[PDB]
Amino acid sequence: PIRRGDVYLADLSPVQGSEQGGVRPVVIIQNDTGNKYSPTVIVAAITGRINKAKIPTHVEIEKKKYKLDKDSVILLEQIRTLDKKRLKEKLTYLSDDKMKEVDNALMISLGLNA
Amino acid sequence: QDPIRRGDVYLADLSPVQGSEQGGVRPVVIIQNDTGNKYSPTVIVAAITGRINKAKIPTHVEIEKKKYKLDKDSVILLEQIRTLDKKRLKEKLTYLSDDKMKEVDNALMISLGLN
């Protein structure tokens, strides 16, 4: 029952260069038909906020509401297809409003409009 | 400012991968916006594979071997997408037409649950 908007812990390693690696939270951005039936999911990496900057492909999430070590940001320029086996525990899920912010950042990141 | 633009098809090394993720050295199409393609250390791409049966998959976009010089008739998989460091990009094979890129945008929207 993996759903779009869920935040899972996942192992992104190994990676190269400026790709985001390590074991970190990721948010599921794949549509729910694929999340239901497919061997893979598509995710965006989350990282620990390290400076207040306005980046159109970034979406901030608060440490408290969602249960997080820190105030974090979702990087919609770091996205990948993972085998579902990579998904460890499910940490949380994002609100509808937050997912709207995410959809937006995603559109920007992928050069899509509407 | 790298000449990397959205729609370009590059050869790239996806390996190593796990399970059903697409690995290997294959063609990929650049789906990132062109500001990021210009300035950023990474690009976002969708994997291309050889077409192994004609099937109607909403997240798949077929591309002909002739118009894009290609070993085979191929399909772009919009459910297999990832951010690569630009160093992973080998030679630039080709670029896709505007119409084809529209098909891609649509498949992408479907794949990511956007409308």
Author numbering:
A (entry chain A): 1 to 114
B (entry chain B): -1 to 113
The authors write:
TA modules are small operons encoding two proteins: a ‘toxin’ that interferes with basic cellular metabolism, usually translation or transcription, and an ‘antitoxin’ that neutralizes the toxin and protects the cell from its potentially destructive activity (for reviews see 1–4). The toxin MazF is activated under a number of stressful conditions via proteolytic degradation of its neutralizing antitoxin MazE by the ClpPA or Lon proteases, (18,30,35) and was proposed to be under control of quorum sensing. In this paper, we present a method to obtain large quantities of active SaMazF and provide the structure of this protein as determined by nuclear magnetic resonance (NMR) and X-ray crystallography. The SaMazF dimer is formed by pairing strand S6 from two monomers to form a dimer-wide 10-strand anti-parallel β-sheet.
Three different crystal forms of SaMazF are available, which lead to the structures of 14 crystallographically independent SaMazF monomers forming 7 independent dimers. Each of these monomers was independently refined except for the eight monomers present in crystal form III, which were restrained by NCS because of the lower resolution (excluding two more variable loops that clearly adopt distinct conformations). Overall, the structures of the SaMazF monomers are very similar with pair-wise backbone root-mean-square deviations (RMSDs) of 0.18–0.58 Å for all 99 residues defined in each molecule (the 8 NCS restrained monomers from crystal form III are represented in this comparison by chain A only). Loop S4-S5 (Ile61-Lys70) is involved in lattice contacts in most but not all SaMazF monomers. Four classes of conformations are observed. The most common conformation is observed in ten chains, two cases of which do not involve lattice contacts. In the remaining four chains, this conformation is prohibited as it would lead to steric clashes with a neighboring monomer. Of these remaining chains, form II chains A and B adopt the same conformation while form III chains D and E each adopt a unique conformation. Loops S4-S5 of the latter four chains are all involved in lattice contacts. Thus, it seems like loop S4-S5 will adopt a default conformation when the crystal environment allows for it, but will adapt its conformation otherwise.
